[PDB]
Design an enzyme around this catalytic site. Structure first.
Site, PDB file in Angstrom:
ATOM      1  N   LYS A  79       1.027  -2.218   8.957  1.00 27.35           N
ATOM      2  CA  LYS A  79       2.360  -1.213   9.011  1.00 27.35           C
ATOM      3  C   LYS A  79       3.291  -2.039   9.650  1.00 27.35           C
ATOM      4  O   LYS A  79       2.983  -2.264  10.863  1.00 27.35           O
ATOM      5  CB  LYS A  79       1.878  -0.085   9.687  1.00 27.35           C
ATOM      6  CG  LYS A  79       2.890   1.013   9.972  1.00 27.35           C
ATOM      7  CD  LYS A  79       2.330   2.431  10.473  1.00 27.35           C
ATOM      8  CE  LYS A  79       3.604   3.253  10.775  1.00 27.35           C
ATOM      9  NZ  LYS A  79       3.018   4.600  11.698  1.00 27.35           N
ATOM     10  N   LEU A 117       0.943  -1.181   0.111  1.00 26.68           N
ATOM     11  CA  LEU A 117       0.015  -0.013  -0.014  1.00 26.68           C
ATOM     12  C   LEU A 117       0.811   1.286  -0.160  1.00 26.68           C
ATOM     13  O   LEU A 117       0.039   2.491  -0.451  1.00 26.68           O
ATOM     14  CB  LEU A 117      -0.822  -0.113   1.241  1.00 26.68           C
ATOM     15  CG  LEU A 117      -2.069  -0.821   1.060  1.00 26.68           C
ATOM     16  CD1 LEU A 117      -3.075  -0.912   2.480  1.00 26.68           C
ATOM     17  CD2 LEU A 117      -3.007  -0.367  -0.219  1.00 26.68           C
ATOM     18  N   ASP A 131       5.179   2.739   0.747  1.00 24.25           N
ATOM     19  CA  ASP A 131       6.497   2.615   1.458  1.00 24.25           C
ATOM     20  C   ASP A 131       7.118   3.899   1.588  1.00 24.25           C
ATOM     21  O   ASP A 131       6.666   4.814   0.860  1.00 24.25           O
ATOM     22  CB  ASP A 131       7.352   1.774   0.462  1.00 24.25           C
ATOM     23  CG  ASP A 131       9.046   1.892   0.756  1.00 24.25           C
ATOM     24  OD1 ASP A 131       9.695   2.682   0.170  1.00 24.25           O
ATOM     25  OD2 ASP A 131       9.354   1.267   1.888  1.00 24.25           O
ATOM     26  N   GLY A 132       8.207   4.056   2.298  1.00 19.54           N
ATOM     27  CA  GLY A 132       8.959   5.103   2.929  1.00 19.54           C
ATOM     28  C   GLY A 132       9.986   4.973   4.062  1.00 19.54           C
ATOM     29  O   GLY A 132      10.186   3.774   4.125  1.00 19.54           O
ATOM     30  N   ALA A 133      10.593   5.990   4.500  1.00 17.88           N
ATOM     31  CA  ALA A 133      11.606   5.538   5.423  1.00 17.88           C
ATOM     32  C   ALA A 133      10.773   4.903   6.927  1.00 17.88           C
ATOM     33  O   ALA A 133      11.614   4.365   7.460  1.00 17.88           O
ATOM     34  CB  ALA A 133      12.046   7.020   5.904  1.00 17.88           C
ATOM     35  N   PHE A 134       9.606   5.251   6.831  1.00 19.19           N
ATOM     36  CA  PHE A 134       8.833   4.433   7.949  1.00 19.19           C
ATOM     37  C   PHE A 134       8.827   3.054   7.904  1.00 19.19           C
ATOM     38  O   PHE A 134       7.925   2.527   8.717  1.00 19.19           O
ATOM     39  CB  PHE A 134       7.599   5.206   8.135  1.00 19.19           C
ATOM     40  CG  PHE A 134       6.682   4.777   6.601  1.00 19.19           C
ATOM     41  CD1 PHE A 134       6.843   5.716   5.607  1.00 19.19           C
ATOM     42  CD2 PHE A 134       5.783   3.931   6.712  1.00 19.19           C
ATOM     43  CE1 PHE A 134       6.014   5.733   4.511  1.00 19.19           C
ATOM     44  CE2 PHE A 134       4.973   3.632   5.413  1.00 19.19           C
ATOM     45  CZ  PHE A 134       5.244   4.558   4.565  1.00 19.19           C
ATOM     46  N   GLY A 135       9.329   2.225   6.832  1.00 19.32           N
ATOM     47  CA  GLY A 135       9.189   0.905   6.533  1.00 19.32           C
ATOM     48  C   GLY A 135       8.020   0.851   5.397  1.00 19.32           C
ATOM     49  O   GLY A 135       8.069   1.736   4.484  1.00 19.32           O
ATOM     50  N   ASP A 173      -1.553  15.679  11.248  1.00 18.14           N
ATOM     51  CA  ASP A 173      -1.065  15.650  10.120  1.00 18.14           C
ATOM     52  C   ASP A 173      -2.389  15.368   9.095  1.00 18.14           C
ATOM     53  O   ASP A 173      -2.374  14.508   8.290  1.00 18.14           O
ATOM     54  CB  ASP A 173      -0.223  14.265   9.944  1.00 18.14           C
ATOM     55  CG  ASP A 173       0.666  13.987   8.700  1.00 18.14           C
ATOM     56  OD1 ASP A 173       0.914  15.159   8.147  1.00 18.14           O
ATOM     57  OD2 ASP A 173       1.554  13.107   8.677  1.00 18.14           O
ATOM     58  N   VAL A 225       3.826  -0.180   4.390  1.00 17.86           N
ATOM     59  CA  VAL A 225       2.277  -0.634   4.683  1.00 17.86           C
ATOM     60  C   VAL A 225       1.828  -1.407   3.532  1.00 17.86           C
ATOM     61  O   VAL A 225       1.826  -1.242   2.265  1.00 17.86           O
ATOM     62  CB  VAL A 225       1.477   0.854   4.589  1.00 17.86           C
ATOM     63  CG1 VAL A 225       0.008   0.453   5.362  1.00 17.86           C
ATOM     64  CG2 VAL A 225       2.070   1.686   5.434  1.00 17.86           C
TER      65      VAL A 225
HETATM   66  C1  LIG Z   1      -3.491   6.858   4.389  1.00 17.23           C
HETATM   67  O1  LIG Z   1      -3.701   5.522   4.859  1.00 17.23           O
HETATM   68  C2  LIG Z   1      -2.503   5.044   5.689  1.00 17.23           C
HETATM   69  C3  LIG Z   1      -1.624   5.519   5.701  1.00 17.23           C
HETATM   70  C4  LIG Z   1      -0.431   4.969   6.640  1.00 17.23           C
HETATM   71  C5  LIG Z   1      -0.611   3.825   7.213  1.00 17.23           C
HETATM   72  C6  LIG Z   1      -1.901   3.113   6.748  1.00 17.23           C
HETATM   73  C7  LIG Z   1      -2.671   3.652   6.231  1.00 17.23           C
HETATM   74  C8  LIG Z   1      -4.029   2.779   5.840  1.00 17.23           C
HETATM   75  C9  LIG Z   1      -4.661   2.469   4.690  1.00 17.23           C
HETATM   76  N1  LIG Z   1      -4.516   2.891   3.428  1.00 17.23           N
HETATM   77  C10 LIG Z   1      -3.526   3.576   2.872  1.00 17.23           C
HETATM   78  C11 LIG Z   1      -2.267   2.902   3.035  1.00 17.23           C
HETATM   79  C12 LIG Z   1      -1.324   4.096   2.470  1.00 17.23           C
HETATM   80  C13 LIG Z   1      -1.399   4.732   1.355  1.00 17.23           C
HETATM   81  C14 LIG Z   1      -0.252   5.454   0.753  1.00 17.23           C
HETATM   82  O2  LIG Z   1      -0.462   5.921  -0.302  1.00 17.23           O
HETATM   83  C15 LIG Z   1       0.968   5.858   1.444  1.00 17.23           C
HETATM   84  C16 LIG Z   1       2.054   6.073   0.770  1.00 17.23           C
HETATM   85  C17 LIG Z   1       3.239   6.428   1.471  1.00 17.23           C
HETATM   86  C18 LIG Z   1       3.438   6.614   2.728  1.00 17.23           C
HETATM   87  C19 LIG Z   1       2.135   6.424   3.699  1.00 17.23           C
HETATM   88  C20 LIG Z   1       0.939   5.947   2.827  1.00 17.23           C
HETATM   89  C21 LIG Z   1      -2.783   4.952   1.199  1.00 17.23           C
HETATM   90  C22 LIG Z   1      -3.867   4.472   1.718  1.00 17.23           C
HETATM   91  C23 LIG Z   1      -5.841   1.528   4.997  1.00 17.23           C
HETATM   92  O3  LIG Z   1      -6.904   1.209   4.414  1.00 17.23           O
HETATM   93  N2  LIG Z   1      -5.776   1.746   6.482  1.00 17.23           N
HETATM   94  C24 LIG Z   1      -4.809   2.320   7.133  1.00 17.23           C
HETATM   95  O4  LIG Z   1      -4.550   2.416   8.365  1.00 17.23           O
END
Ligand SMILES: COc1ccccc1C1=C(Nc2ccc(C(=O)c3ccccc3)cc2)C(=O)NC1=O
Length: 291
Positions: free
Chosen positions: A42, A19, A21-25, A134, A27
């Site tokens: 995550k 889903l 990627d970044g420096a945070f590991g 954020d 998802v």
């Molecule tokens: C904004 O959502 C999250 C954000 C961070 C962690 C988890 C989630 C998240 C979901 N969806 C995601 C996860 C990742 C992304 C990204 O494009 C992305 C790319 C780079 C860095 C960070 C995110 C989009 C939707 C979800 O369905 N339940 C969750 O908690």
């Protein structure tokens, strides 16, 4: 309390996609082998106990939020050198991704639903003195039923229990309140939580115009622009109701002391009569039709 070290999540969860990627590991999208339910996973590889504190606080935040408009904690694991946070998966995706897929911004009725649900979520969080810090359209997820889920409490969790403000960000902070840009010590004031209200206002313009204010600048100038500029506005005001423009005028208050709270904004006529998520269901259904 919520972290299990006995069981290996790879036996419980199947990684079925990536889903972000970044420096945070990373998802991941994960499907549980027993139930088949989906989850965002995550995964952070870290052995230092200082760094692990930041991520356990995120688990703690999600565990105490029983409100529906916050992503739910599904479970947590630590073994090998990785911490797994299993989070509610939102099949609709983030609002920013939906605007890219449809190549348009949200309509005003759609923004009203998002605004109303974001305000109820913030009122719930702030009553627990949980400040998101954020907010942006990328952190507003959608269910297929047309409700939002606020996501990514990473910045919230690193600032929750400490008194030293983490003056440290990644990327371009288009949504940062001007007192935070100026590095004001907001924890010694009544108004730390007001930063979220400013970010909410920027998020509404982002959903109206697809991109946030100052996206057209060299990203290096955004902090200075936020500090020195008048509050952003909808650039095509004739496209929008006076209630929307008025809501933005009061929310995007540069002074955090007079900026309204989420509860005050729930009284504003832009959202005070929003009771149905229908407009967001249509938006999700239309985005599902494109792919
Ligand atoms: C904004 O959502 C999250 C954000 C961070 C962690 C988890 C989630 C998240 C979901 N969806 C995601 C996860 C990742 C992304 C990204 O494009 C992305 C790319 C780079 C860095 C960070 C995110 C989009 C939707 C979800 O369905 N339940 C969750 O908690």
């Amino acid at each position: 309390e919520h972290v299990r070290r006995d069981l290996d999540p790879n036996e419980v969860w199947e990684i079925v996609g990536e889903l972000g990627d970044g420096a945070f590991g990373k998802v991941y999208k994960a499907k549980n082998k027993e139930t088949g339910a989906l989850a965002a996973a995550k995964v952070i590889e870290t052995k230092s106990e200082e760094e692990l504190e930041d991520y356990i606080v995120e688990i703690e935040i999600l565990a105490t939020c029983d409100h529906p408009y916050i992503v739910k904690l599904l479970g947590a694991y630590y073994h090998d050198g990785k911490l797994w946070i299993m989070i509610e998966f939102c099949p609709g995706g983030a609002v920013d991704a939906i605007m890219l897929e449809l190549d348009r911004g949200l309509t005003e009725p759609q923004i009203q639903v998002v605004c109303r649900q974001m305000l109820e979520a913030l009122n719930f969080l702030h009553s627990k003195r949980i400040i998101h810090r954020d907010l942006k359209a990328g952190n507003v997820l959608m269910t297929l039923e047309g409700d939002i889920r606020l996501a990514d409490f990473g910045v919230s969790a690193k600032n929750l229990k400490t008194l030293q403000k983490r003056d440290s960000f990644i990327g371009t902070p288009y949504w940062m309140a001007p007192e935070v840009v100026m590095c004001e010590t907001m924890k010694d004031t009544p108004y730390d939580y007001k930063a979220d209200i400013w970010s909410l206002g920027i998020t509404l313009i982002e959903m109206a115009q697809i991109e946030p204010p100052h996206h057209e600048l060299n990203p290096m100038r955004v902090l200075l622009k936020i500090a020195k500029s008048d509050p952003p506005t909808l650039l095509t005001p004739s496209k929008w109701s006076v209630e929307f423009r008025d809501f933005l005028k009061i929310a995007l208050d540069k002074n955090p002391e007079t900026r309204p709270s989420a509860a005050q904004l729930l009284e504003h006529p832009f959202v005070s009569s929003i009771t149905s998520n229908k407009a967001l269901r249509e938006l999700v259904a239309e985005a599902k039709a494109e792919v």
